[PDB]
Amino acid sequence: GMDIIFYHPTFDTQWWIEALRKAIPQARVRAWKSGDNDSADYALVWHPPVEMLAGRDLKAVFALGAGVDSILSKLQAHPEMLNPSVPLFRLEDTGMGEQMQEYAVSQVLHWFRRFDDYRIQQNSSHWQPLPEYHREDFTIGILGAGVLGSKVAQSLQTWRFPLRCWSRTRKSWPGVQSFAGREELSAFLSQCRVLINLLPNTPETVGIINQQLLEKLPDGAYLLNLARGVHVVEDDLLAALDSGKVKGAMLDVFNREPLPPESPLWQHPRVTITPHVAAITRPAEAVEYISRTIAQLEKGEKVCGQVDRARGY
Amino acid sequence: GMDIIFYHPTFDTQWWIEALRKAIPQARVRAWKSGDNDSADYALVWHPPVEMLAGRDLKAVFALGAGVDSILSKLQAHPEMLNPSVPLFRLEDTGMGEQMQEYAVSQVLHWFRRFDDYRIQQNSSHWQPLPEYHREDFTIGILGAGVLGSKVAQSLQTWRFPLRCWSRTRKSWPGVQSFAGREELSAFLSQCRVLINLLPNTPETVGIINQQLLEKLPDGAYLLNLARGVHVVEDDLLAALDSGKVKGAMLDVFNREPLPPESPLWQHPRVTITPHVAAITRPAEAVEYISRTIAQLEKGEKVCGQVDRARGY
Ligand SMILES: NC(=O)c1ccc[n+]([C@@H]2O[C@H](COP(=O)([O-])OP(=O)(O)OC[C@H]3O[C@@H](n4cnc5c(N)ncnc54)[C@H](OP(=O)(O)O)[C@@H]3O)[C@@H](O)[C@H]2O)c1
Numbered sequence: 290g291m292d293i294i295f296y297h298p299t300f301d302t303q304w305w306i307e308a309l310r311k312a313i314p315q316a317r318v319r320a321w322k323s324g325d326n327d328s329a330d331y332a333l334v335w336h337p338p339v340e341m342l343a344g345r346d347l348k349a350v351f352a353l354g355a356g357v358d359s360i361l362s363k364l365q366a367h368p369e370m371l372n373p374s375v376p377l378f379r380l381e382d383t384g385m386g387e388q389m390q391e392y393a394v395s396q397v398l399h400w401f402r403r404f405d406d407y408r409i410q411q412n413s414s415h416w417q418p419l420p421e422y423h424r425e426d427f428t429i430g431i432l433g434a435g436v437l438g439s440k441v442a443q444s445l446q447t448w449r450f451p452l453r454c455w456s457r458t459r460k461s462w463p464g465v466q467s468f469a470g471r472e473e474l475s476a477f478l479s480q481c482r483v484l485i486n487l488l489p490n491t492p493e494t495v496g497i498i499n500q501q502l503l504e505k506l507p508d509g510a511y512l513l514n515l516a517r518g519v520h521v522v523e524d525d526l527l528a529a530l531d532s533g534k535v536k537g538a539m540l541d542v543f544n545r546e547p548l549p550p551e552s553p554l555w556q557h558p559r560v561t562i563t564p565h566v567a568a569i570t571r572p573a574e575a576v577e578y579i580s581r582t583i584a585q586l587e588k589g590e591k592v593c594g595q596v597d598r599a600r601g602y
Numbered sequence: 603g604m605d606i607i608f609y610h611p612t613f614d615t616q617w618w619i620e621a622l623r624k625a626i627p628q629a630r631v632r633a634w635k636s637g638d639n640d641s642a643d644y645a646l647v648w649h650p651p652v653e654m655l656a657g658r659d660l661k662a663v664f665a666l667g668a669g670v671d672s673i674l675s676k677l678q679a680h681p682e683m684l685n686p687s688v689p690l691f692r693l694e695d696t697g698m699g700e701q702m703q704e705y706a707v708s709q710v711l712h713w714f715r716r717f718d719d720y721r722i723q724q725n726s727s728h729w730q731p732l733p734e735y736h737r738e739d740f741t742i743g744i745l746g747a748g749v750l751g752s753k754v755a756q757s758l759q760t761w762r763f764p765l766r767c768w769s770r771t772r773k774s775w776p777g778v779q780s781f782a783g784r785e786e787l788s789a790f791l792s793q794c795r796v797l798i799n800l801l802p803n804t805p806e807t808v809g810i811i812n813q814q815l816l817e818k819l820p821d822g823a824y825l826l827n828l829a830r831g832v833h834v835v836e837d838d839l840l841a842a843l844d845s846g847k848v849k850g851a852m853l854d855v856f857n858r859e860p861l862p863p864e865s866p867l868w869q870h871p872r873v874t875i876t877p878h879v880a881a882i883t884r885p886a887e888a889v890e891y892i893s894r895t896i897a898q899l900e901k902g903e904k905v906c907g908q909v910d911r912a913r914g915y
Pocket residue numbers: 355356357381382385432433434435436437438455456457458459470471487488489490491493494515516517541542565566567568569602
């Protein structure tokens with residue numbers, strides 16, 4: 290027997306309540322409303338009101354996304370919101386791995402096969418075969434080598450691209466050269482024909498894709514920003530696009546979302562925009578992950594997807 | 603010891619001569635010019651003049667492409683051109699398998715992830731997440747189930763799309779439903795959300811993608827024409843694009859190449875054009891295939907890539 294409280298600003302709350310009840314048939318599940326200070330064992334949340342969590346000795350909180358910068362930022366502003374005893378979990382993969390693979394493989398191949406150049410030629414009804422690019426000139430760098438970065442690297446290794454990754458700690462993936470820490474970032478960047486961002490938003494990574502980073506990339510590089518908008522200094526990117534340093538950028542996330550209509554990114558010729566849909570939260574998969582994790586916690590088994598609040602992700 | 607004659611209208615003849623000499627060091631290799639009636643054992647050709655082959659009792663002819671409709675059409679007009687004793691080979695895969703996989707996977711995923719819809723929205727600086735498509739609604743049909751069709755099917759099976767193929771004779775690929783012959787074509791087409799053309803050009807397949815074929819596809823279908831332009835009745839395709847039957851078409855080949863500037867395909871909003879570059883002939887790989895095949899022929903080993911002139915491919 291357990292009590293679960295659920296809160297999400299826009300999802301179908303009734304659907305989630307019914308799905309959780311079936312997946313955890315001993316659970317009593319309820320939508321949280323202001324004033325509800327009754328007991329709860331677990332909370333499933335996205336942009337929770339401070340009142341929902343403050344003072345609660347919960348057994349766990351599950352954030353309904355892969356990224357937790359929104360909740361950690363709220364906690365820094367409202368230290369009373371989550372007691373230090375409460376473990377915080379995020380959604381680990383739950384179908385977002387495959388979605389990131391779909392997006393990255395499609396667009397890496399799109400650029401590798403010069404579909405952007407052919408489109409420009411098509412606009413003028415101009416027929417012209419172009420030289421083939423070669424894999425040896427198309428090293429792919431993955432900024433962030435975690436749950437999603439590993440999946441993307443694996444799918445691209447299938448296509449025989451040279452690969453490198455960047456993280457805080459060394460990785461062991463065969464055939465993927467691992468770079469670690471800020472002291473190795475310039476060497477990492479030097480060969481990245483395509484730079485794929487899959488970092489979390491933390492104080493240590495804000496603004497990392499800036500003028501100084503972009504200048505270290507090879508000429509005619511491509512940027513795929515799949516992580517958070519705050520990683521990219523948008524005016525520095527525009528300057529690199531305008532100079533020809535960056536040949537193309539595909540961006541799924543932005544400093545402000547929805548991306549305001551005055552942003553020059555919308556109409557810039559070498560930019561492709563998607564509205565934070567690279568890997569969406571699928572409710573059924575989230576319910577399965579959460580129910581399995583609660584069961585593991587009850588059995589004293591090791592759990593993977595716990596957030597380290599001191600580290601920030 | 604052997605004599606090889608080489609002819610190609612545009613490739614780097616001197617490079618090919620030197621590469622063949624190194625790959626087959628007992629071979630005497632020469633570029634063919636009008637008037638050369640000296641002896642030859644093997645001919646490597648693309649759009650050969652009739653005079654180059656007429657009357658020659660060659661041990662084999664190698665056509666420097668995957669498709670042989672150009673040479674077979676010439677032979678039908680000039681029956682003296684190739685003696686019936688001369689076996690005809692084409693390029694089998696030689697890197698074109700992987701190239702077709704790159705093209706098909708990139709674009710299938712592009713459509714599956716609604717990048718064409720997001721681009722339309724981007725053109726108006728409009729932010730709007732769209733519903734996910736689901737694999738169960740995205741059956742991919744491969745028209746032609748040969749060397750290249752099998753490779754494309756295999757790469758797409760990796761992504762868990764439902765798959766079906768169409769050919770003259772039954773296939774055994776696990777997880778790919780095999781349809782065979784014109785009597786089964788309407789059933790094949792009924793579920794194809796994406797139709798990928800990898801047929802050869804033969805009298806039996808000319809014009810197959812016409813009004814009657816397109817009307818049997820599901821609504822909002824996609825066409826990827828990677829094979830020959832003569833397979834598609836361009837005015838029927840335009841009508842299906844204009845009515846909304848076909849949501850998008852990506853075309854690498856056309857009835858006339860270069861595609862004339864008056865064609866409505868160039869500027870049509872849901873059409874993407876590439877200039878017959880889906881899988882190009884790579885010289886080094888072609889030289890390796892040809893030298894290996896000649897060695898197998900000398901040893902009396904079984905050879906795969908022989909054209910059946912009676913069948914037409
Ligand atoms: N639709 C979307 O666009 C979408 C959907 C899902 C997720 N996301 C984003 O993707 C992010 C990644 O998700 P994930 O599940 O892969 O996270 P994860 O498994 O926590 O991976 C994070 C990775 O980033 C690295 N990292 C963190 N701080 C770093 C630093 N200061 N220097 C170098 N590397 C650093 C970590 O290094 P270690 O391996 O050394 O710890 C780790 O490899 C989320 O945080 C979210 O923002 C976006």
